Amino acid sequence: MTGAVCPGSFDPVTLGHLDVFERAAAQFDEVIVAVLINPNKAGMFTVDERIEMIRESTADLPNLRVESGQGLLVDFVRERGLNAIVKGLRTGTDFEYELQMAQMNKHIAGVDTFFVATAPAYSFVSSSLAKEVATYGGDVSALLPASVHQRLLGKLR
Amino acid sequence: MTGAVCPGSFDPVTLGHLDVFERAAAQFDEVIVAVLINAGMFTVDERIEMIRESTADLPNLRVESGQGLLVDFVRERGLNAIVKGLRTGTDFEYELQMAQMNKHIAGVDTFFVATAPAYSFVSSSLAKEVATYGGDVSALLPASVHQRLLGKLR
Amino acid sequence: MTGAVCPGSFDPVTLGHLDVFERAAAQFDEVIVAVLINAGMFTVDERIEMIRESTADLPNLRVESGQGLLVDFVRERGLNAIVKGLRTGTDFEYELQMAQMNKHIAGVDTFFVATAPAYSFVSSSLAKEVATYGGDVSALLPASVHQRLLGKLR
Amino acid sequence: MTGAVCPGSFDPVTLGHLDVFERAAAQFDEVIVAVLINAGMFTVDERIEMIRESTADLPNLRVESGQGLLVDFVRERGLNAIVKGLRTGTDFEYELQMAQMNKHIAGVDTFFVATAPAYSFVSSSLAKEVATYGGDVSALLPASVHQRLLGKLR
Amino acid sequence: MTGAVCPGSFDPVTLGHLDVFERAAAQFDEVIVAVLINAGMFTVDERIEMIRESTADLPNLRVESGQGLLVDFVRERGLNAIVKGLRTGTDFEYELQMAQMNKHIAGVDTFFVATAPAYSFVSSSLAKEVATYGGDVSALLPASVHQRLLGKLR
Amino acid sequence: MTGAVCPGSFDPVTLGHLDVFERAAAQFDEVIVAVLINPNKAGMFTVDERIEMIRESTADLPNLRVESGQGLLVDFVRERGLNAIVKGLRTGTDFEYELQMAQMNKHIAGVDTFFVATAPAYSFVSSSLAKEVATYGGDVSALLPASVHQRLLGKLR
Ligand SMILES: CC(C)(COP(=O)(O)O)[C@@H](O)C(=O)NCCC(=O)NCCS
Ligand SMILES: CC(C)(COP(=O)(O)O)[C@@H](O)C(=O)NCCC(=O)NCCS
Ligand SMILES: CC(C)(COP(=O)(O)O)[C@@H](O)C(=O)NCCC(=O)NCCS
Ligand SMILES: CC(C)(COP(=O)(O)O)[C@@H](O)C(=O)NCCC(=O)NCCS
Structure with a gap:
């Protein structure tokens, strides 16, 4: 019953994200990747495309599932009876804003x-x-991840 | 005759902002909250009201709106000190640059x-x-702002 | 089954550390507080006792002393995660390096x-x-600590 | 033979940028200032002219416009180094990522x-x-810039 | 009757320190430079002299030595404001914690x-x-400190 | 005549240092690695050992040489008619202190x-x-680097 949500726009998912998903999946009993969508801001990829890219790259993780949502992240987390968020850090992360949030x-x-x-x-x-x-x-x-590179170049061309 | 100006957009004013207002008022003779327009969620006129309402108990504090350079606002009132607050997420490097x-x-x-x-x-x-x-x-x-922010959405 | 190690010198444990312990205990099946030693104000056993008393209501947390590499202490107990707290003044760059x-x-x-x-x-x-x-x-x-601390200053 | 590229939008060039240019010009055999474009206050050619005038006494520095990847502009001129300036407010974490x-x-x-x-x-x-x-x-x-700037505000 | 305390070891006092002293004196009615002993290169007695010498032109500033908590030093003089300077290399996160x-x-x-x-x-x-x-x-x-620092080495 | 000094205690040299040496060597006409020694603070390695470890790892760099020194770094730099310092950055670098210096x-x-x-x-x-x-x-x-690992374990045992 231990579990965490990994949130982001994932437009597209990166290997930095995948690395974090894998560590979350290894340490919590379940992981939900939350693909958070701004209903007024279109990204490069549709929700379906964003979700498929993540699924194709996380197939080896049996306790990870992917869902989209919007609004408050904590509502997404608590609706699933969870109480934890796992957020990745990279070079260029606005860590002070992440701390405020x-x-x-x-x-x-x-x-x-x-x-x-x-x-x-x-x-x-x-x-x-x-x-x-x-x-x-x-x-x-x-x-x-491989599920992304092709699709990305397709969007660009 | 010491004095300081506390600038911001205050869109709306938070308890973080009030805390700074209070400390400034307790350390300078005179304090002027400068509401620098740039709209947002509120009109300048009501940003001011919410600040005035939350700071009616600070005798030596008053609220005005400004435009243009903050340094002209401060100096055209015969002062030369700014008091700025720091919170988690403040872009302090930009603050230092300014x-x-x-x-x-x-x-x-x-x-x-x-x-x-x-x-x-x-x-x-x-x-x-x-x-x-x-x-x-x-x-x-501040309770002055809370019930007012709700009514401006719902 | 899940677990993390909360490492530190805890000389003495603070409410900041306890906050971290509680959040780890709430998420993971098992938490081990690792008291890793170096000279301080309290002995290892004194530190351990103080943590045990502070974490009395956390049934899935235990406290042990450690020496050697932290990652050895962690993998020898069958775990693979460290949970570290962040406060004002932490030196996060060093934490990231570690x-x-x-x-x-x-x-x-x-x-x-x-x-x-x-x-x-x-x-x-x-x-x-x-x-x-x-x-x-x-x-x-924690109340346990405040007495044992002031009772060591004398 | 040595060389570096000094990239930027330089809209307009500042004495901060010029300081960097001079130090690069003093160390490397060849410096190229790359004016990489996006909308601004000055045109590319206006920016380039302003840099050329500011760097008149640097015989081993030249100024060119660029588009595309910065690393392409660099390797196409036979070079392999970028020199970037740091100031108060720079966003060094983003620079490091880049x-x-x-x-x-x-x-x-x-x-x-x-x-x-x-x-x-x-x-x-x-x-x-x-x-x-x-x-x-x-x-x-730089004096060249101050006139052309104020003469654009009108 | 506003006031602030400017604390430090001032071992020795720098022009960075003086600049802060001056700004504080221009914004508060009364300023007290607190030389908090902890020796170093100088005795407390001569740290004070060098500060007094460099700040003789600041009428509303005076220099005393202190021991124990800085907050007791400040409050046992009926004040409740500290003014601290920031430079390149200031451990500002520790400053915030304090x-x-x-x-x-x-x-x-x-x-x-x-x-x-x-x-x-x-x-x-x-x-x-x-x-x-x-x-x-x-x-x-300050020239008061320079010739004195040399004579304490050579 | 372009040149830079790469300073440090190098006790021992790391692959992080070597990476920086190589980039300096590629961009400046000459590089001098300055092994700066505190005459009152013994490190783990002697100056000879520190210098040999660096030399054995930089043999493929024809324009890099290694020298020890003490006192002010800028005196070391200017005595050799140079005017540049190249300093590496890593996770945990005290960058604010490096900037002050x-x-x-x-x-x-x-x-x-x-x-x-x-x-x-x-x-x-x-x-x-x-x-x-x-x-x-x-x-x-x-x-x-290989010139270091053995020697390090030897010192420890
Ligand atoms: C109003 C503000 C302080 C920003 O405040 P904010 O962070 O609350 O939005 C800043 O934008 C400002 O000073 N505006 C006035 C124009 C000015 O003075 N520009 C020069 C800054 S050095
Ligand atoms: C004990 C601690 C976690 C630091 O704890 P502290 O900051 O509370 O004093 C750290 O010093 C440590 O890991 N000691 C064990 C030795 C070790 O593992 N060194 C390798 C660090 S990458
Ligand atoms: C032009 C610049 C250096 C930024 O310059 P600026 O900060 O002065 O505006 C950067 O945006 C850039 O590199 N543009 C070229 C496009 C590119 O190379 N993108 C990849 C960056 S890793
Ligand atoms: C004297 C000083 C300000 C440090 O000043 P410094 O950075 O110039 O060395 C600090 O060590 C201090 O406040 N000492 C008094 C003891 C104290 O108040 N400790 C509690 C700090 S929250």
Whole structure:
């Protein structure tokens, strides 16, 4: 009954995210990846595409499932009877903002946030920077799971 | 005749902001909360009311709106000190950059003070965002602002 | 079945550490508080006793002394996770370096959690230094500790 | 033979950027200032002209426009190093992320240099914003720029 | 009757420190530089002289030595405000931790102010270290301190 | 005539240091590694040992040489007619102190400091942390050059 939610926009999911999912999956009895959607801001990928990319890359994790949602993250967490958020840290993370949100989320809902640093190899990739580099021809193939690289280049072209 | 100006957009004013207002009022003879317009969720006119309502008990504090440079606002009132609050998530490096620029162009000092731990994670933006999605931020805002923020959404 | 190790010198344990312990105990099936030693104010056994009393209502947390590599203490108890608290003044860059080292050499993960705002400025060293010079740090330490501390200053 | 690229939007160039240019020009055989574009206050050619005039006494520095990946602009000119300045408010974490990305995808190194204290609080954006509202930022910009800037506010 | 205390070891006092002294004196009615002993390179008695010499032109500033808690020093003089300077290399996270502790145990506010860019990289330790190895730090220390620091080495 | 000094105690040299040496060597016409010695603080390795470990690991760099020194770094730099310092950045670097020293060094001697981040793989090793981990049996072999690992274990035993 131990469990955590891993939230984000995942547009697209990166190997930095995957690294965090795997560590969460190894340490909690269940993990729910929360694909949080802004209903007014279209991303590069649809919810279906975002969810499929994550599923294809997490198939070896039997205790991880993927769901989309919107609104307050702590409502998503508590609706599933959970009380924990696992958030990844990378180079360029706005950690001070993450801390402010962690304190806010604990205050309004009693939900705890656990931060874990992604591996050095995956520490400089982010969804936005990966899309930017790929838009101008840069090779980001080593920084994204296989379910993503193709689809990304397709969107761009 | 010491004095300081406490600037911000106060959209709306939080308990973090009030805490800073209070400390400034207890350490300077005269304090002027500067509501620098730039709309937002509130009109300038009602940002001011909410601050005045939450600070009616501070005799030596008063609230005005401003436009243009903050340093002109401060100096056209014969002062040269700014008091800014620090919370979790404050972009303090940008604050330092503005502090040095402001001292350079006008000789105005900036004093930073940490807000109380209890209000260290509330910010105007975050409180609005949580309150829109239906979370309770009543412990983080003055009662003057709370019932008013709700009525401006619901 | 899940578990984490909460390591530290806990000289003495603070309410900040206890906050972390409680959150780990609430999430993981098993928590082990590892009292890793170096010279301090309290002996290992004194530190352990103080933690045990502070965590009396946490049935799934136990306290042990440790020596050697932290990752050895962790993997020898069949676990693979460390939970470390964050406060004002923590030195997070060093923590990150240690977390990446510990992952590299042993596959052990480190999860960080921010202690509550009320407990975010107490550290063992600062509480001792304040108590030393006659400051009241009772509200920052568990009741068990405050007596045993002041009773060691004499 | 040695060389570096100094990239940026330089809208407009500041004395902070010029400090960096001079230090790069003093160390490397060849420096190329890359004016990488996006909408701003000055056109690319206007930016380039302003940099050329500011760097008139640097015979081994030239200025070119760029589009596409920065690392492409660098490796196409036969170089493999970027020199970036640091000031108060820089966002060094983002710079580090970009530096590690640029090394990963192209083998290009990034060297960072702190601008001199006198020039450490000016940024293009802040100087424009201050000038906009009638602040004197003449001492923070090259003489060539101060005129062309104020002559654009009108 | 406003007032603030400016604490430190001042071993020796730098131009960074003086800059803060001056700003505090221009914004509070009364200022007390607190030289908190803990020896070092100087005796407390001569740390005080060097400060008094460099601040003879500040009428509303005076210098005393203290021991024990800084908050007792401040409050046993009927004040409740501390003014601390910020430079490049200030451990500001520890400063924040002390600021919150000090507010908690005694209700004393801490105001931080950035020192002028020109003195932003001098610190007592670093100036001593450079001056021992024979580098010129005369532009970073008051002339009262300079000739005196030399004579205490050579 | 372009040149830089790479300073440190190098007790022992790490792969993080080596990474920085290589980048400095690639970008400047000459590099001098300055092994700065505190004459009152003995380290784990003698100056000879520190210098040999660096030399054995930098043999493929024809424009790099190694020298020891003490006192002011800027005197070391300027005595060799150079005007540049290249300093590596890693996880845990006291960057604010490095900046203070950079500004101080520019002020008193006109010497410029260029900072470069070591590769992610070598970003969490430091001389002190490597000695500590090795003291308690931890495997740091992947984080140090071959000229170091043996000698280190020898010192410890
Ligand atoms: C109003 C504010 C303090 C920002 O406050 P905020 O962080 O609450 O939004 C800042 O934008 C400001 O000073 N505006 C006035 C224009 C100005 O002075 N610009 C020069 C800054 S150095
Ligand atoms: C005990 C501690 C966790 C630090 O605890 P502390 O910050 O509370 O004093 C750390 O020093 C430690 O891990 N000691 C065990 C030796 C070790 O594992 N060294 C390798 C660190 S990567
Ligand atoms: C132009 C710049 C250096 C930023 O410059 P700026 O901070 O002065 O605006 C950066 O945006 C850039 O590199 N643009 C080129 C596109 C690119 O290379 N993206 C990959 C970055 S890892
Ligand atoms: C003297 C000082 C301000 C440190 O100043 P420094 O940074 O110049 O060395 C600090 O050590 C201090 O406050 N000493 C008095 C003892 C005390 O008050 N301890 C509790 C701090 S919360």
